[PDB]
Amino acid sequence: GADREVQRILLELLNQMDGFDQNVNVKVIMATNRADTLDPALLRPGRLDRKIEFPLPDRRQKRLIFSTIT
Amino acid sequence: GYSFSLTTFSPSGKLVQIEYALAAVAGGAPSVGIKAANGVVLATEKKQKSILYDERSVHKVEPITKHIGLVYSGMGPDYRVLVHRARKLAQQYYLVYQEPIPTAQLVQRVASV
Amino acid sequence: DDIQQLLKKINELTGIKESDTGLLAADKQTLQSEQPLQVARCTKIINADSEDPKYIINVKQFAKFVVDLSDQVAPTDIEEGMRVGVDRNKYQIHIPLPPKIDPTVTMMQVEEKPDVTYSDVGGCKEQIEKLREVVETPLLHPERFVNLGIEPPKGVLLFGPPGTGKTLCARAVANRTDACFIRVIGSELVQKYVGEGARMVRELFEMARTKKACLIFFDEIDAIGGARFDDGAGGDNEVQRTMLELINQLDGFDPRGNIKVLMATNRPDTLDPALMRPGRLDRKIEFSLPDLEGRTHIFKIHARSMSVERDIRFELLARLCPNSTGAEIRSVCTEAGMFAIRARRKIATEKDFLEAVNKVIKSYAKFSATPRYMTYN
Amino acid sequence: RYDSRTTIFSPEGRLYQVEYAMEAIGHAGTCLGILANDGVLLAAERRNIHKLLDEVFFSEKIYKLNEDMACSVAGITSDANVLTNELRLIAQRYLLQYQEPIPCEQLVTALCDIKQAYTQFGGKRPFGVSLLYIGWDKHYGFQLYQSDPSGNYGGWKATCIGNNSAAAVSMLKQDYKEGEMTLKSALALAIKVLNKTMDVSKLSAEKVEIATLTRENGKTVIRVLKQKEVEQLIKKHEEEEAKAEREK
Amino acid sequence: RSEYDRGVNTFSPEGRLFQVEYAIEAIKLGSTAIGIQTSEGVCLAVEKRITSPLMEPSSIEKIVEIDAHIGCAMSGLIADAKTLIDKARVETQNHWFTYNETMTVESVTQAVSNLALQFGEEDADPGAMSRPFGVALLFGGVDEKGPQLFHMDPSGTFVQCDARAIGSASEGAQSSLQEVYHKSMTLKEAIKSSLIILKQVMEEKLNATNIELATVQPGQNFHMFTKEELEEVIKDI
Amino acid sequence: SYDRAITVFSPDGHLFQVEYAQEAVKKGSTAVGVRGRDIVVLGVEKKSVAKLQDERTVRKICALDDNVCMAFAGLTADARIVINRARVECQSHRLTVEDPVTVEYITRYIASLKQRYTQSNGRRPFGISALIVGFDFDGTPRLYQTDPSGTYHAWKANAIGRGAKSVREFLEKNYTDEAIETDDLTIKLVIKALLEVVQSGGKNIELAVMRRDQSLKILNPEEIEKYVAEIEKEKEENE
Amino acid sequence: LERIKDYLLMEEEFIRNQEQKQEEERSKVDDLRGTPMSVGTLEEIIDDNHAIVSTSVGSEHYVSILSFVDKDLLEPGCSVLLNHKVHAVIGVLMDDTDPLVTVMKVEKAPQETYADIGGLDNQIQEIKESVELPLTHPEYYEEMGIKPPKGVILYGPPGTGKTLLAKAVANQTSATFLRVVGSELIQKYLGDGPKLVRELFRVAEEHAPSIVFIDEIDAIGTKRYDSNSGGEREIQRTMLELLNQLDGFDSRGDVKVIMATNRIETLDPALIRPGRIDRKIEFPLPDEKTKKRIFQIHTSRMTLADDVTLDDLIMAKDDLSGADIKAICTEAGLMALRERRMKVTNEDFKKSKENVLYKKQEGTPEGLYL
Amino acid sequence: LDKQIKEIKEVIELPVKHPELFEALGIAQPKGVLLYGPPGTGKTLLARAVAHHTDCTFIRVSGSELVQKFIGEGARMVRELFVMAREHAPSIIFMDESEVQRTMLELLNQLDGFEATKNIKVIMATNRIDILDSALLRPGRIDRKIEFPPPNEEARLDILKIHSRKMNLTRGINLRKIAELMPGASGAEVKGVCTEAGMYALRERRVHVTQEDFEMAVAKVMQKDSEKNMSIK
Amino acid sequence: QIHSRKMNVSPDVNYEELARCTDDFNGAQCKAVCVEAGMIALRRGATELTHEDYMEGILEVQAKKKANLQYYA
Ligand SMILES: Nc1ncnc2c1ncn2[C@@H]1O[C@H](COP(=O)(O)OP(=O)(O)OP(=O)(O)O)[C@@H](O)[C@H]1O
Ligand SMILES: Nc1ncnc2c1ncn2[C@@H]1O[C@H](COP(=O)(O)OP(=O)(O)OP(=O)(O)O)[C@@H](O)[C@H]1O
What we know:
This is part of a larger assembly, with 9 protein chains of 9 kinds.
Chain D: H1 16-24, E1 31-34, E2 40-45, E3 62-66, E4 69-74, H2 77-98, H3 104-120, E5 130-137, E6 141-147, E7 153-155, E8 158-160, H4 165-175, H5 184-197, E9 208-213, E10 215-216, E11 219-220, E12 223-224, H6 227-244
Antiparallel strand pairs in D: 1-2, 1-8, 2-9, 3-4, 4-5, 5-6, 6-7, 9-12, 10-11
Helix pairs in contact in D: 2-3, 4-5, 5-6
Chain G: H1 3-18, H2 25-32, E1 37-41, E2 51-52, E3 62-63, E4 79-83, H3 99-104, E5 105-106, H4 121-130, H5 132-136, H6 138-144, E6 151-155, H7 162-171, E7 176-179, H8 193-206, E8 210-215, H9 235-247, E9 255-261, E10 279-282, H10 289-299, H11 310-316, H12 322-338, H13 346-356
Parallel strand pairs in G: 6-9, 6-10, 7-8, 8-9
Antiparallel strand pairs in G: 1-4, 2-3, 5-7
Chain H: H1 2-11, H2 13-17, H3 19-25, E1 32-36, H4 43-52, E2 57-60, H5 76-87, E3 91-94, H6 101-111, E4 120-124, H7 134-137, E5 144-147, H8 153-163, H9 175-181, H10 188-203, H11 211-221
Parallel strand pairs in H: 1-4, 1-5, 2-3, 3-4
Subcellular location (chain H): Cytoplasm; Nucleus
Protein name (chain H): 26S proteasome regulatory subunit 8
GO molecular function, one term (chain H): transcription factor binding
């Protein structure tokens, strides 16, 4: 299959992510714009609990980025 | 083997080539149509790549009949072919029934093409 | 439960029996002398020097040792490039050592002769003839080749469908070779250490060179790294080195000289191009599925041992076998006897074979052999 | 492997391309019909509802094919438009030749032979449309029919094709009564079956399209129920559920 | 093979034509048919190989009448043989219609071969016969020249044969024929010889149902369905 | 060689795509036929009632002409096309020759239509093996069967479809000159043979009879039950 | 409570297995032998009795041999035993095969004879003629002139109990049975794995009549495909060594091979050929008569109500395997225990079949189409 | 999932605790469990819960193939795992994946039932049953194929109560309505509604969770995807 | 010609025609055609090797093998 080996990686990561050391939580931050690894299972609460979408800087957000860089 | 032909069914869902054509439509200049109580207003973004291109030449919003107009999003060469065929079907209707083609019927005939 | 008790009682009786049952001059004077006798570890000499010889020897993994000759030795007897035994305590060459036999390479040599005549192989006269002048006639009568000034191919590759008879012919050549036959164990050539197998291949040729006129049978050439993808991972790198070592020793910078190589492969396509190239293997004797005259002959040879009615027609049975390898034809003969054993008839009849012909070919999922389609008649 | 050409036959005698198209009908709005003594009905799910879409066109999944026949389409949208036109053409062509409305089974057999041909000829893909036919003919009376992309057809007292067809068929088999459908009862069966098959909650009028064919004064009178008529049937089903409460 | 067998259009690097050879292979699936040509006449013998007791014997047609003076035996695909047999039957009658005379056995064999050759002409009836036919036909007839037997093959190649065998066991039959055949053989002697060879090369015993025999001789007409004499000749042998 | 392509041959010599078509016939419901002295009879199985589905539309046994009737086994739609073409030819044969179609002619016509699909790519070989039973003019009863390969054969009695081989083995022992002695005895032989592969359903049988002097009549379900009971009594008498 | 007697028999048997020197000659050898003795290969033999011996450290010093029992057994490649310090050959060479090979040998077969198996009688006949019959009555094969078939392959859908036939052969076999999975040749080291295949066969020849079972042969040999990516499985080399052992020069002596595969098409043609697998046995999914015997055997040792209809379950559902029948019987017993009835009602069997067959979904729209 | 838990108890707890009942019944003990759910909700919680309440050795082997013919080790994933389970006679092995073909075959031969001691119960818990091999699915190797459904409205209320046990819910909260508001939830989603709702309170710096906070969380956990003009069919 | 120099080749043999026939042949294969031709002549006992014997060598080196096939004659 070839693709199966990549799928095997997704399963292995999902098993580790499950519940990790509850209080000493190993927080995992993901910024991959890929639907193939974006299975519903990864998106399930208990895996990627919070989803934040980054909008293209608009007016006001751009003014802040420009002011800080200048 | 699927996604390379429109003559074969997807092994589960639908033929992918029509969906790829929709992708080309998506990569098109923005076109906005607003039906209103007393009329329909259609618009497109016509931006020449360079100042040299003349803005008075090829026209994106083109009349098909006195009361019927068409706007397009997608590959520009393909639009001219359907702009001609749609106009012709409107004329064939006038010759056969001596009435300007109804807008609903023209859309059905254009869709068949 | 009483029957179970009888077995338990039997076990108890055995337990009672076991408990009740419970209730040369070499080992003499020679041992007293033997324990003092010292050891001499083997090592290989690489050089010699003027005046004090100071021969320097690599032990085999230890170090280059500058060891003087032992007092009770002859300096002439010790020689450069000669295996020697050096006592660790006295640090001197007490006794020289004879050259290593390398027995594993010696083991591969057939030594025994397989008892199969060329007569038993059947339906491949042309394949036998091609092998005869690369294996028997050039060695037995080299004069004819010299008269035309034509060299023998000195190499043969036997390839064909499985069960054709390639190895059967090879054992037959071994029976009448009249020269050393060296069957090669393919797994033995692959070794745990890097290039350890490649060292063995050099030894294989060296053994072949020492004997005069010998044939080496590399059966299952695919096992001996018979491919050269040689990808970046280089998983087969150790085997690929072993394959190249065979190729160079086989031909180039002085080749076999008196060695004829016979290689047999079920899949010829997989074999690496350099090995396939001639000179390494000039002849390409492909074995083929037997024709109807061959199919009758293979049936007759296989069935000669079996007791059968004298009126059986092998020609009909061979015709009923459209494309059968020799092994499958042998399978029909054995299966026909098994049906007679099932019905307890000592002498088999033509019908028994026909049932076997259906069983060996049609009953197997060939699909073509079994016809449900009216299609053609 | 043995896919691609409708022409290739698998080693198990299976035309996968035809089978794939028949499976494909599932991704479509639910269409169901009940034979109904003294009537016949076709009900469809109006999927893809949006505030901007006008819905000016009368109907969307229900098309009349004759004065006395109608069909509901579930499948590829373009293929449906091709088939509906041909079905309308065959109906008038029979009337021109014999001056009598086409018997319902015949209109179905004719489209089915066209659908069948596409499967036997290499160049084209098998049709992706399956449809339900409601009509009245003098020879066999009120009838309901189903057509498949394979080109096979059948007459069903009740059947469903789009979306959760098995769920509707299971509900229909238990609820349906032979000879006692009595049109108004059949309309109720449809609203109840629709509620189960659709994941939609409350079965709002916009989501459902109901067409009823009856023979009145010797003339078939195919009618598509207006939203107000559909709304009253929905309220009655909701009230019946309220009556069921506590007792259930 | 090794590819280049996808169509008769492709040519092998060796220059051989695959597909034509594959059609020659199909004949082997056929039952053996033996034809012997003698001055008294041509004898055709075939192995009926009836599949089931229930099926009617007549429906399997291994020996057919092209015309009163010509008879044919087919080994290979049943449907393919029918198309070729019909052409020979139309052609013999058309030659009579145009020339008011009986077509020679060689000319019928030539005419049938012409359709067989069009495996892929690309001009004649396009969409028909895209592949080689899989049937070998033995045409035995008495013409003006005299008794003649002609063998056609799937590749359109035809030859006059004093004795010939087609189908499975053809190879075995031919070897037997070379020993048995002689120029002075009578038709009666040939008829006995053909069945004797057929019995040796057929697994089933040569009972009257198993073997169908045919004989065309100058004095008589086709007479190629010996009936109940199948029992008489077999018992005498 | 290759299975995929109707015209590519095989090194052994086989058009596999045609053989793959025969598989669809085997997956079809069992149908049997017998040749009777005056009552040629064909039997069908697997009525397979589907509860809310009308069974007038399912028509495994379809008549082609007054003297000839046919039963198909295989893909239902492909069968509908072949039956209609055979029906047109029967009428055309009457227009071209004013004599009713002999049974052999219609089987040869059905074989030719089937062969024409086999000959070229762009067409799928028809997946049906119809059994045609009728009495020709001159009142001779005949039974013929057509394979998807385009071959046709004449059979005293034959079975097609699922478990066809089992029915044929049963007929090989059962079919006798005595069995065709009486019109009822011939109907009984079809019922007995059909019962073996029809399971214990009994109701799942639709035997149809050709009088050879009259017209095809589908037997009434009650009439079929009476014959089934008579067979059970005869079996009890043998016990 | 007859279980106590059975438990006692098992404990007594273990005790029996647990309970299974010369005045001067042995003591002298005990003195001669070192407290620690290291076993090493023999490289060269010399008449003086000082013979070169290879070792892990490679000290090949010629060493004297003084073996009281016998010193004539020395051979090239023999594993001699040497003193830890003096390094002299102590005596008779150690004669033990590699540890991985020892695990395969099986002395006890849990299943009994062919009685437990039902409806595979044709399959039983083939295995017996190839395995049990030649040993029991060798004369018949010689008189026929046939050499007994030495190789068998059992190929069937999952749960047709191909392994059960192998377990039955183990119960009644004179021959030592070596049970090796095909997937037990994963040796990571280059080499070694093909050598292990050689080791299993050499042991089989040493034990004279022997039966080799290689369950799941698909892993060891499939396709013989090219290296492709260049990973190079080396499994193909392992399969080639097995192919060599079965019929690759020399002879196989008296060793019989039984091999079982769920899928036979994948297996490479060379391995599945006459001469390596002379007889081929096919296990089909059970029909009706075979199902009746299996259902009876599984329910034979359980409480059965008169109400239960074994025939109804077999006829109503077609496709269940022999293993599936056993699962229905175990599930039915659990279904009854829920109601606290040791006796099993017909209702329990009906519920049981439904629970076991919930994962088997097959077929698409192939109903109206044909 | 109470019915599912009882079936798991029957396959694992009942044979180990009472071997005699099976012998008296005449039925061999069930040795295989497969937990499959399309959402898959609860499959591990059952396996982890069995692990706390086991009284048997629990071995977890959710790892992939690093051993076998790779540079790693030989037969570690299957042959070694069973041998360790033999050392501890009451043992249950939980597998969270069908892996590399040679390894999967080795698992099948070990699970065939050559274990006379047995007392080894495999709680395989992998979704997408269709991909799994039929030989692994064969009843002798895996006796039961328990299915974990998406939680029903009653079940969602029960899961909501379990995860709202520590939360300070204000009086007037309707947990029942919140279960109804999210239909076809994945159970973990019900757990998510509580965690997100609590964070709304945490950002507002209050420990008093309110009905609105649960409703807003239901929307945040819920995800909706749509495309336009691809609505053909 | 270079390899066949030792062998008694007939003057009639034309190397250019043989070379045209041996398309895509490595030099060693060309040597092989010469070596095989010598053995082929030896099999028939020919004192000298004719051009046709060389042609047979080309087929044997290719492993093509030759026979009458019909559809050709
Ligand atoms: N032509 C033949 N004459 C006699 N026996 C034959 C012949 N061909 C095959 N056999 C039989 O087949 C077996 C010989 O097979 P052989 O040792 O030649 O290996 P092979 O199967 O051809 O080799 P490979 O497995 O590498 O393809 C014996 O049983 C032998 O009797
Ligand atoms: N009924 C429930 N009550 C409480 N929490 C639950 C419930 N079901 C699921 N959960 C929670 O949601 C998680 C979902 O586990 P789920 O079984 O879906 O995936 P997993 O942990 O990867 O296990 P597996 O791989 O076996 O599916 C549980 O681990 C648990 O935290």
